[PDB]
Amino acid sequence: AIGEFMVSLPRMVYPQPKVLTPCRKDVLVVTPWLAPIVWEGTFNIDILNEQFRLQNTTIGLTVFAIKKYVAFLKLFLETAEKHFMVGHRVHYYVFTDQPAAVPRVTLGTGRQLSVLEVRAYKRWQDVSMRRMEMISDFCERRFLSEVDYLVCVDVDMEFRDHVGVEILTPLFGTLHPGFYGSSREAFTYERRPQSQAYIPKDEGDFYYGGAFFGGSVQEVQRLTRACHQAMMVDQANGIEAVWHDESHLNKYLLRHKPTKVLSPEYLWDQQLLGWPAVLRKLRFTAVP
Amino acid sequence: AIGEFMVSLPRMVYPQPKVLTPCRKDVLVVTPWLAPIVWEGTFNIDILNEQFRLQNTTIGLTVFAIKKYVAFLKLFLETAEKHFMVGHRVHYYVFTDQPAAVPRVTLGTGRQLSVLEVRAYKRWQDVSMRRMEMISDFCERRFLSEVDYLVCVDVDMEFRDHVGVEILTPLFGTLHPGFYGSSREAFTYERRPQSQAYIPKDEGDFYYGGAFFGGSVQEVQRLTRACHQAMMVDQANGIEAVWHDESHLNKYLLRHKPTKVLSPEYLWDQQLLGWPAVLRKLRFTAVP
Ligand SMILES: CC(=O)N[C@H]1[C@@H](OP(=O)(O)OP(=O)(O)OC[C@H]2O[C@@H](n3cc(-c4ccc(C=O)s4)c(=O)[nH]c3=O)[C@H](O)[C@@H]2O)O[C@H](CO)[C@H](O)[C@@H]1O
Ligand SMILES: O=Cc1ccc(-c2cn([C@@H]3O[C@H](COP(=O)(O)OP(=O)(O)O)[C@@H](O)[C@H]3O)c(=O)[nH]c2=O)s1
Numbered sequence A, B: 001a002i003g004e005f006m007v008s009l010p011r012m013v014y015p016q017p018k019v020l021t022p023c024r025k026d027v028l029v030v031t032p033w034l035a036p037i038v039w040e041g042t043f044n045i046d047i048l049n050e051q052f053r054l055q056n057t058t059i060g061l062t063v064f065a066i067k068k069y070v071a072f073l074k075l076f077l078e079t080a081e082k083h084f085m086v087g088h089r090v091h092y093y094v095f096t097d098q099p100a101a102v103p104r105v106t107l108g109t110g111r112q113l114s115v116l117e118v119r120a121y122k123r124w125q126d127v128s129m130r131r132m133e134m135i136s137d138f139c140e141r142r143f144l145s146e147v148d149y150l151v152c153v154d155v156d157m158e159f160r161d162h163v164g165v166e167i168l169t170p171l172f173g174t175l176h177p178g179f180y181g182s183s184r185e186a187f188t189y190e191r192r193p194q195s196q197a198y199i200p201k202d203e204g205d206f207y208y209g210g211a212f213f214g215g216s217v218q219e220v221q222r223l224t225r226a227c228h229q230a231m232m233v234d235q236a237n238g239i240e241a242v243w244h245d246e247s248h249l250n251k252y253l254l255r256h257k258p259t260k261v262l263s264p265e266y267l268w269d270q271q272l273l274g275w276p277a278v279l280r281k282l283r284f285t286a287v288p
């Protein structure tokens, strides 16, 4: 459940936080709307685990494995078992056009997987974009009654390190690894005013990656519904956003500020970007 | 109201947040449980004002003016008019044993004041401690119907700079100005195991000041009720905590982590502690 009130922790022994000696001095760790930006060194996972376990938190994880991308499922799921929300209840939701191709993966206690059969669109743009419609639809059918939070990610990825309850919050986006150091004018937002995803050059906080977002079920339902609706308006007007669902996600999170932002530790591509000093951990990374 | 969902902001023009060049490098701006610590330079008040105004947020502000402390009310209230939550709905609650002694203070639009007549305890220790019972009682009687958030402060104070919606959150405490740079062994927690407020030398995040705490009405009701009950247990056991209600506030916020923590900008004594470089603003300060 998502508790109505603050929970009561047991006695715990850990290092005193140091008001005058912040660990991360190299990166911004809070947004201008006072949302934490989650980097290694900003959180004590023992405190956060207690808080979330005391609420018997269930996390749903959606992933789309359409056409040849079913190949990615085995590593994705096996690494999620090692690194994603270990100790908490997890419900995996695998959307696929090939239920029989979902690999048999052994799950730890309190963890379950459901296979959702869906349509395979012809164009990769449509496969990517239609995820918003499909997640939104399933928030109603399944997720609202089954999980507390939803985490929505790309499948061509593996977990290499801890991804845990530090990410959970009503609404979150993740800094795209290609743009975390970039100026807003360089962000590849949709720039045509004819598109619902339009963001002009003097607006923008961050460029969020389409491959990792989430929040409470109700906030994810609202976001995915809104993005789908915007995409449908664009389609009726004969326009397709430059970065598809990611463009609409960015317009959405611009106007609806996320309550946490994840650092690129949570969405990385080591082949393209290496391992910069600013990344103390690489947690969720692209597979070739 | 307190909105159920994230609100939608209009287009806004402001400086881009800089992921790789944080403004505050001299202080901790997030706790290990990912609560913001509120300092000047961490927030854009225009964004926050929009978010809170779109929810028609009403803020209650409680102050006790018992016996001779009625003398502090004029300056407290006149300065609150200049600096506290300007632009938002405010409801002042003045708890006093002398209703006729409450000074006439002209209020801005959307701001009102209620005088709550209460008993004056003989011992100043009880006057201070009984605030918890009294706040809790009125949460049920008045506050739940009248305001969205409660801010509970000492009256022997004046506002000198902005105190606004950046502080609002389900539950907050404020860093006591005498200890923000101190080690937890130097915190003046209650150290006797016999007391409900007991905190041993190897525990504690911060030393919070009893003169400024708050949160949603429901969380403040729970905190004040719990602190009152703990004080009543101590009383039955023949014990009185070293710093009274503040000792119990500290025990409560140790086990129920606040969702924001305010820096000592929000609780300062300039005569006693001067004006360290780390304080860019002095917002709410002691009166001689
Ligand atoms: C690590 C990284 O930076 N990922 C980014 C990067 O992701 P990406 O290029 O690897 O996109 P993907 O190939 O993974 O497609 C997105 C997701 O959509 C699903 N998908 C995608 C596809 C295809 C996408 C492009 C194709 C080329 O013909 S096929 C597919 O055939 N079947 C399928 O199930 C799958 O879950 C996949 O992970 O670029 C996107 C925008 O398009 C985002 O910016 C994203 O954050
Ligand atoms: O003679 C010693 C006293 C200590 C507190 C007293 C008191 C406090 N109060 C309230 O408790 C708050 C805390 O007491 P304080 O400001 O004197 O405490 P400190 O700032 O010294 O910690 C005050 O701000 C008032 O709101 C009163 O209303 N009337 C009082 O007579 S009187």
Ligand SMILES: [Mn+2]
Pocket (backbone or CB within 6 Å): A154, A155, A156, A211
């Ligand atoms: Mn991908």
Ligand SMILES: [Mn+2]
Pocket (backbone or CB within 6 Å): B154, B155, B156, B211
């Ligand atoms: Mn005082």
